[PDB]
Design an enzyme around this catalytic site. Structure first.
Site, PDB file in Angstrom:
ATOM      1  CB  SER A 205      51.500  50.503  67.353  1.00  0.00           C
ATOM      2  OG  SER A 205      50.199  49.924  67.172  1.00  0.00           O
ATOM      3  CG  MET A 284      15.786  61.877  74.270  1.00  0.00           C
ATOM      4  SD  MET A 284      15.391  60.501  73.800  1.00  0.00           S
ATOM      5  CE  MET A 284      14.066  61.404  71.723  1.00  0.00           C
ATOM      6  CE  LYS A 359      14.003  53.762  59.466  1.00  0.00           C
ATOM      7  NZ  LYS A 359      13.416  54.942  60.669  1.00  0.00           N
ATOM      8  CB  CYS A 433      12.909  58.215  62.014  1.00  0.00           C
ATOM      9  SG  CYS A 433      13.702  58.292  63.656  1.00  0.00           S
TER      10      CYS A 433
HETATM   11  C1  LIG Z   1      54.071  49.960  57.870  1.00  0.00           C
HETATM   12  C2  LIG Z   1      51.849  50.550  57.110  1.00  0.00           C
HETATM   13  N1  LIG Z   1      51.184  50.378  56.009  1.00  0.00           N
HETATM   14  C3  LIG Z   1      49.435  50.973  56.424  1.00  0.00           C
HETATM   15  C4  LIG Z   1      49.338  51.260  55.190  1.00  0.00           C
HETATM   16  O1  LIG Z   1      47.935  51.885  55.155  1.00  0.00           O
HETATM   17  O2  LIG Z   1      49.637  50.010  53.837  1.00  0.00           O
HETATM   18  S1  LIG Z   1      49.807  51.133  57.958  1.00  0.00           S
HETATM   19  C5  LIG Z   1      51.086  50.385  58.954  1.00  0.00           C
HETATM   20  C6  LIG Z   1      51.067  49.901  60.319  1.00  0.00           C
HETATM   21  C7  LIG Z   1      50.011  50.711  61.169  1.00  0.00           C
HETATM   22  O3  LIG Z   1      50.037  49.135  61.830  1.00  0.00           O
HETATM   23  P1  LIG Z   1      50.005  50.049  63.459  1.00  0.00           P
HETATM   24  O4  LIG Z   1      48.818  50.858  62.976  1.00  0.00           O
HETATM   25  O5  LIG Z   1      49.259  48.570  63.931  1.00  0.00           O
HETATM   26  O6  LIG Z   1      51.332  50.365  64.248  1.00  0.00           O
END
Ligand SMILES: Cc1nc(C(=O)O)sc1CCOP(=O)(O)O
Ligand SMILES: Cc1nc(C(=O)O)sc1CCOP(=O)(O)O
Ligand SMILES: Cc1nc(C(=O)O)sc1CCOP(=O)(O)O
Ligand SMILES: C=C1C=NC(C(F)(F)F)=NC1=N
Ligand SMILES: C=C1C=NC(C(F)(F)F)=NC1=N
Ligand SMILES: C=C1C=NC(C(F)(F)F)=NC1=N
Ligand SMILES: [Mg+2]
Ligand SMILES: [Mg+2]
Ligand SMILES: [Mg+2]
Lengths: 507, 507, 507
Positions: A205, A284, A359, A433
């Protein structure tokens, strides 16, 4: 036709029809992507009909072979042979790999997200590449049977390819990579031994669904073939001199670093004291809209403290806020494997962005590293390398590993194993901490061409140092605490580390 | 493995897991129908994943070969090659047949429902069998691109397998076939030259979705290899003798048939008058709920007449009712290819059931045959044959063809072509919808051993014979009508055909 | 027909037809419960038509009389007269008591939930038994016109039964009782003078809704006629000796107990240090899911601090969590009667589980008692017995009452009144939430064989002793706090209770 050793997995493009923006075609985007650096192409049709599928595989197979880039086909092996594709790529619920090879001889990708799977890929012998897990969360994959595995989960896989010496099998990362993480995924997705990393980044995408495939693809290329990940505007590069500790404490005092604490309430009053005591200013705030503005302030630093009531979408945004500005995050996974909810949460947090220092104490550091006094040293190294960071481990001895490695990445120097990264010790004899708060301040004052490793080391000294002083003027745990802060105040004001009790050696 | 010559398409079972009754399994069903009738089995998995598919296809290929029956696989040829299937069946929108055979050498099926598709099938030369169009409507096929075609549609396809002479290719009818129409389908789905009919019936839901496949398969079998379709409880089997016309008119009088008129409002009052003349009982119910009780009544007849502003949902309901009781149906397609809405509507009606008679004139008869005076004979013959029925065509002469053929069906005698069937003619020099009413009354009163073909002819005579008489005693269009009904009354009372005007020859 | 004095209230089963598991009948459940422990049945049909009601009451009155058990009918009294039933149970919105008595002479049950109702049930004289309020929330009571009342409210009612001497009246508690709360209800539901307790438990959905009525009924019986509620894995049983406060302070140091503070912000940082000084470890978790894990950790202890921003659902979750593992809870109702919302919230919390100590001051402890110096003792003693707890009253003097009576319960030794219990006092002359944290830590360290009481005392001493000492070494408010923590540190380290300023007397 191509050959196995000819495939270039750098920028692997996986296709999606129902996602292309209005008035643009599939051929339209995929071309823009070839022109600007895509170097392999998978056609993915879960929905269309076998005829239209073929019709468009031929139309795109042409477009590809014109740029001398192969064409893989997703799970429809027959379609593949049908049109003389160059490789097919099947997942875990598709045709068994032995059967696939008995109808072809040609390149095969297997969708792996677990080490066990890599085991079986190896009980087979020369499957040619693998898509690695779902690194992140993504709404492109309809009805998914896995879960966002993180970079750590992808390391666990890279590491099994080494246990098995499966030299023959390349790898690509897939699942939600965009320019806000591509760098970090390349930068941490490397096997412990350092000998192997990702062979390429794989998007869907980010290009397919872009108004400007051209522009988008040029960017990804740009991230992909660059080798320095400068994640925090401080240098990342031989024991720490006294005069170094000095100017470090100078800079932090001269800079009045703003340190944002997202921590519980207990560590909260205490922490803001220690910060104040070091000439810095705590804040904070755990307000989401505010996070962008705090981080924009000069010499601003973030301190993270697992389990602090703050909702994860905000820790996500907080972390992100600061990596966007190239600023330092210190991570303190207090809880850790102590509980179910906490293991789960930290592991989630650790995927949100790049930390400058983590840490924890013997228990925490040991958990994070997935594994005495020699053993501690080992696990600190393990963690610092595994999250590419300065990783502090506390106790009578403080160990400080530097696994940032200049901030170098590649697609297979990577050669510097876990056990080669520099690690030191800090002792002062038998004496929490607020360490976080110290380091945070130290690191926050450092100027551009400063140094991250020394800074953390200065912090652990300054703290261990004040510890002795206070340990000696207390009447009890109550007054120790108010004395500890005081010591910290007086100590950084008389800037004379040469007169400090704690001794710093090599691990 | 098998040979193309060994595939038995008698009863062809197609698979669908998402439809199996709670408590039963695919294997469950697919076994039952193997023990009780099925002779060929296709696996259909439009949803499941490539692995699971193969797992269940292997599980069933064993169940088949165990009964020496083959196993075809739907659209997924790789899955076929992988598991060693005996054949694959593709669609029009699935892989081209050229490419499939270039991967295999094993039987191929092809879903067809249009002569042009047969035209291409032929320009390939020895594709091995075809699933013939959607015969009736079905909610088994999720999102369809065809539209139910009816037997008329199937015929038009068989008819192109002879024109192009594709000896080598077999046929199976598919879709919506249940026990309430397999006979009618087998029966009228024959090529126009009588040579080639279907080789198999193909069901999906009548078995797979059955709360007892065992039983349902036994019944399907019973039908497929039975050879006599006795659709009307009348005989069906040399010019009509005066003594026959006489005992026909007695029977209808001694039986007072109940003639249900579903027709327009202008043939309505008239037709009731005619029915009353002939000693029968008009009823004019276009009521859906009443339909089945009306057919119960002894010697009940049905007369249809396109464009009667009863819902087609009713015409379907109605036609069905009388065929379930094996009672006769006269069909008159007044409208026809006169408009659009009419052609459409008649064609749909003609798919609803099995008619004992189809009367129409010149324009109608010629339209139905999809095609002077020698011409009307040839056309009347075609119509009769096509809809396996007694077909009356009106004009100067009335031609009456008998295309019933004792009610014979086969899976390819059937060889009694159009031209051969009995066709008579009735003349009476130069002298309308009451014909239908009359024909219905003559057929209505025949008892099990009477003969459909004769009944019709008597009707045409009687009518043509009231014709002369009233042409003579009329003063114009008005009284001609009232003398026609009057003549009909007198003629049948003084039942003495030895005197009536019209000449019955041999077309 | 039974007698008034022959009714066994022990385990009183109420019916419900709509809530029965598919496959089981009402006959089935009730029967099952009869064999395994039920000692009273009441039919309940708020829905079915009076014919069907009746068909069932007979069928069921038979099954009851076979196991020698009575049967009551709800509110439809005519249906009781009609089928010869053994008693009827009516509510507050049902037919006046007198009117019922005028038509029957038989046993009568009344749903009470406030003292007023008892006052009325009193100035009437010999109503046989009352069903006591709604103890816990329940969805088995469709459209409820009351409000869950808790064991606290139940006691109020049991006490009007003494103020009135209604010796002729039995009780059963009803409303959401399940095995996770029967013990506690049986244990704290007793008269203020201890002369009276509950005569049985009433359940609906526990048996009627069970996928195994047999097993559910056996369990509930098991709990009802036991006599030990061991609710904390500690002792429960003559002034506390120096040797003891000493062995106590050891156990707690040598066992470093994890003390989970569910408190505000201001007792947080402070409270954590007190815990720390005592050699034990603070957990500030208000996370709803961790809470099960936190209590599985050894020598673990929970401190509640009313109004802590933590959602009430979490407080329930948390409180339940610790009781399921028998680990001690320390309750500190800071707010209390101060506001409206607080009073409300505190009572909701109190009916959630079983606490080991309730600390509070003059205001708090006077409030909790529902009621100077002779007075605080009387009030402290009340609050201890009412909530079956060791209850502490901070002030100039500190009062500790042990009202846990070896954890015994009955069905009416119960007789050890509010006044009788041990109450000791702690003076140091004229000298915050730290006391809770201290006591939490003493209690936490105690092993299987320790004693909850002494531990509580120890803590109060140690905290009081710490006071004198910081009061001496302080120059103001602030120094005082830090000096207080220190003294706890020192005082416990040199575990030498012989030398402490505070004096321990009987009260
Ligand atoms: C077709 C496909 N298989 C996946 C797996 O998890 O192995 S992810 C995925 C598409 C996701 O890609 P994007 O976020 O860039 O669209
Ligand atoms: C899978 C399939 N193809 C069809 C076509 O019209 O070619 S019909 C059909 C399914 C119909 O089966 P039934 O109605 O017996 O369940
Ligand atoms: C019928 C009825 N009256 C109630 C009251 O609180 O007075 S409770 C109740 C039934 C609830 O039983 P359970 O919650 O154990 O299923
Ligand atoms: C599920 C997948 C996993 N990995 C890959 C890739 F890396 F592109 F081969 N493609 C997929 N469809
Ligand atoms: C669409 C189809 C058409 N015909 C056939 C069959 F006749 F059985 F081969 N199967 C199908 N799935
Ligand atoms: C509302 C009710 C209250 N109490 C009781 C009983 F169990 F009898 F005490 N039954 C009821 N239906
Ligand atoms: Mg797949
Ligand atoms: Mg298909
Ligand atoms: Mg009632």
């Amino acid at each position: 036709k191509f050959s196995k050793e000819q495939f270039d997995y750098s920028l692997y493009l996986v296709t999606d029809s129902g996602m292309i923006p209005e008035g643009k075609t599939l051929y339209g985007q995929v071309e823009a992507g070839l022109q600007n650096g895509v170097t392999l192409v998978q056609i993915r049709e879960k929905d269309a009909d076998t005829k239209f599928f073929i019709e468009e595989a031929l139309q795109i197979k042409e477009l590809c072979h014109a740029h001398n880039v192969p064409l893989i086909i997703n799970d429809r092996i027959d379609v593949a042979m049908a049109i003389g594709a160059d490789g097919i790529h099947v997942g875990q619920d598709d045709m068994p790999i032995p059967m696939i090879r008995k109808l072809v001889g040609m390149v095969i990708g297997w969708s792996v997200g677990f080490p066990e799977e890599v085991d079986e890929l190896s009980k087979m012998g020369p499957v040619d590449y693998i898509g690695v897990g779902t690194l992140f969360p993504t709404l492109t994959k309809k009805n998914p049977k896995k879960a966002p595995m993180g970079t750590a989960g992808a390391i666990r896989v890279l590491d099994a390819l080494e246990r098995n010496n499966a030299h023959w099998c390349r790898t690509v990362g897939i699942g939600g990579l965009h320019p806000d993480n591509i760098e970090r995924v390349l930068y941490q997705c490397v096997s412990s031994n350092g000998k192997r990393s990702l062979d390429g980044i794989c998007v869907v995408s980010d290009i397919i669904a872009s108004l400007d495939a051209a522009k988008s693809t040029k960017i990804l290329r740009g991230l992909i073939d660059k080798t320095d990940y400068k994640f925090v505007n401080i240098g990342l590069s031989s024991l720490t001199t006294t005069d170094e500790i000095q100017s470090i404490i100078s800079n932090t005092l001269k800079a009045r670093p703003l340190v944002q604490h997202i921590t519980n309430k207990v560590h909260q009053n205490f922490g803001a004291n220690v910060t104040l005591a070091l000439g810095s200013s705590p804040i904070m705030s755990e307000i989401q809209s505010e996070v962008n503005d705090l981080a924009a302030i000069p010499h601003a630093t973030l301190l993270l403290n697992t389990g602090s009531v703050a909702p994860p979408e905000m820790l996500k945004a907080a972390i992100r806020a600061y990596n966007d500005v190239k600023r330092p995050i210190v991570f303190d996974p207090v809880g850790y494997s102590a509980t179910e909810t906490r293991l789960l949460l930290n592991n989630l947090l650790l995927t949100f962005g790049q930390f400058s220092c983590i840490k924890g104490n013997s228990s925490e550091i040991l958990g994070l590293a997935e594994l005495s006094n020699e053993l501690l040293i080992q696990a600190t190294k393990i963690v610092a390398f595994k999250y590419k960071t300065v990783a502090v481990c506390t106790g009578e001895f403080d160990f400080i590993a530097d696994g940032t490695i200049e901030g170098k990445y590649s697609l297979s120097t990577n050669g510097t194993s876990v056990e080669d990264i520099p690690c030191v010790a800090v002792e002062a004899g038998p004496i929490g901490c607020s360490l976080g708060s110290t380091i945070a301040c130290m690191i926050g004052g450092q100027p551009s061409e400063g140094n991250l490793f020394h800074a953390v080391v200065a912090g652990v000294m300054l703290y261990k140092a004040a510890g002795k002083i206070a340990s000696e003027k207390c009447n009890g745990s109550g007054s120790f605490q108010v004395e500890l802060i005081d010591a910290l105040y007086r100590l950084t004001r008389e800037n004379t580390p040469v007169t400090w009790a704690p001794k710093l050696t090599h691990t």
